Symmetry: D2
Amino acid sequence: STKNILYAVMALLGELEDEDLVYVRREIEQRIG
Amino acid sequence: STKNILYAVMALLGELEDEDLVYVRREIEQRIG
Amino acid sequence: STKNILYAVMALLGELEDEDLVYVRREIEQRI
Amino acid sequence: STKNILYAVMALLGELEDEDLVYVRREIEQRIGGR
Ligand SMILES: [Ca+2]
């Protein structure tokens, strides 16, 4: 379920530090700009 | 370190569709601009 | 919080096949 | 991939204390108890 996985990802994002979000953002940008 | 959480998030992005990544991006922008 | 991580884990268990849940169960058993 | 998610979950178990793993174990019993 993409809805279920997205919910889990959202919960986990809040446990990441600002520096970690750089890498998440980069992965997103490589997929959808 | 946050490396376990970052690993899990990065792994799970591969289970999400392109349209789902937009929501992750919004949550990142909410925090770091 | 650690609680937020726990709830993410619980949600992800619903994505796993029975055989992968056995693997998780075994790791938990060896820890506790 | 189910194995992809499995290894994500395994990494996250390292962020949990033994006390928290009890709830994970109980959830697993709801899903594959007796199997
Ligand atoms: Ca938000």
